Amino acid sequence: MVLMTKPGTSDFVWNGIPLSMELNLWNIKEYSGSVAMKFDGEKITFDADIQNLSPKEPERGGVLGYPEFYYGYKPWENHTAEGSKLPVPVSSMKSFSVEVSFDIHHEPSLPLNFAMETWLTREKYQTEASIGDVEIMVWFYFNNLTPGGEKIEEFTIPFVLNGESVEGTWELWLAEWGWDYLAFRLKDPVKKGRVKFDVRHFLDAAGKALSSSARVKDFEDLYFTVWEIGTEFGSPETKSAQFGWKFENFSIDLEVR
Numbered sequence: 001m002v003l004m005t006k007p008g009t010s011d012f013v014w015n016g017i018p019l020s021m022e023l024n025l026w027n028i029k030e031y032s033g034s035v036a037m038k039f040d041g042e043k044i045t046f047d048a049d050i051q052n053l054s055p056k057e058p059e060r061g062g063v064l065g066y067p068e069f070y071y072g073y074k075p076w077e078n079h080t081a082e083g084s085k086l087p088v089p090v091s092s093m094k095s096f097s098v099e100v101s102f103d104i105h106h107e108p109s110l111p112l113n114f115a116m117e118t119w120l121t122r123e124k125y126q127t128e129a130s131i132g133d134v135e136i137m138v139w140f141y142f143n144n145l146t147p148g149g150e151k152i153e154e155f156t157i158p159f160v161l162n163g164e165s166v167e168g169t170w171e172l173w174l175a176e177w178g179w180d181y182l183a184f185r186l187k188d189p190v191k192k193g194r195v196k197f198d199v200r201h202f203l204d205a206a207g208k209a210l211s212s213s214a215r216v217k218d219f220e221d222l223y224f225t226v227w228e229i230g231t232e233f234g235s236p237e238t239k240s241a242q243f244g245w246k247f248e249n250f251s252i253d254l255e256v257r
């Protein structure tokens with residue numbers, strides 16, 4: 001049982017899997033209202049009803065926070081729950097399946113998404129990402145929110161949605177900021193459902209997308225550090241946010257060559 005009502009990180013174990021939950025409001029200068037994130041052994045829930053919001057780093061634009069949970073090592077926080085099998089070199093990953101059920105609710109106009117991501121780093125345990133590293137996101141849902149940078153292509157990547165084998169069409173957005181940002185955004189966003197997919201398909205498309213970059217070199221030698229699952233929300237214009245979610249039936253399976 002884990003309960004947090006302010007920003008912070010806590011570890012937990014879900015069906016034997018060591019994980020970390022972060023009530024991540026990294027780009028929020030200050031807020032009024034309440035946030036509550038909880039793990040009860042069977043589900044992780046998050047609820048927010050906050051106001052008086054403004055960006056911590058205004059000039060970078062983009063979102064305000066990212067309440068999430070993750071498996072592995074999150075560089076920015078020098079943190080991992082114990083017993084984690086990540087990070088591992090991208091070249092060593094044969095497959096990395098992620099499965100989770102989700103139910104996201106939100107006031108109608110809120111910029112928000114259901115996004116999962118990883119950070120690929122040159123060194124195994126960096127404490128930040130910079131030039132030469134990569135941030136790769138996978139968005140299964142979005143509302144009044146587009147990824148950063150611009151769309152550079154589309155990839156058809158399969159996955160199991162609510163128990164059925166489907167093919168998703170994913171727009172790939174790339175931005176060269178302090179690191180390389182890549183976001184795969186599903187054309188038919190899903191607000192509630194269950195998905196199972198292999199992160200390897202996204203790592204394969206990302207590596208190809210960057211095969212001529214002068215910034216990202218030797219993609220396959222980078223370390224796949226973590227797998228975060230959460231909901232980014234907000235924009236420089238967002239003054240308040242009312243939303244919440246429930247994640248259940250979580251599991252991952254890393255298979256290394």
Ligand SMILES: OC[C@H]1O[C@@H](O[C@H]2[C@H](O)[C@@H](O)[C@H](O)O[C@@H]2CO)[C@H](O)[C@@H](O)[C@@H]1O
Pocket residue numbers: 024026062063065066076077135148181232
């Ligand atoms: O900038 C450090 C900050 O990054 C947070 O991840 C951001 C990422 O920087 C941004 O490019 C993307 O649009 O959104 C993600 C998630 O909101 C990270 O979660 C923080 O821990 C870190 O302090």
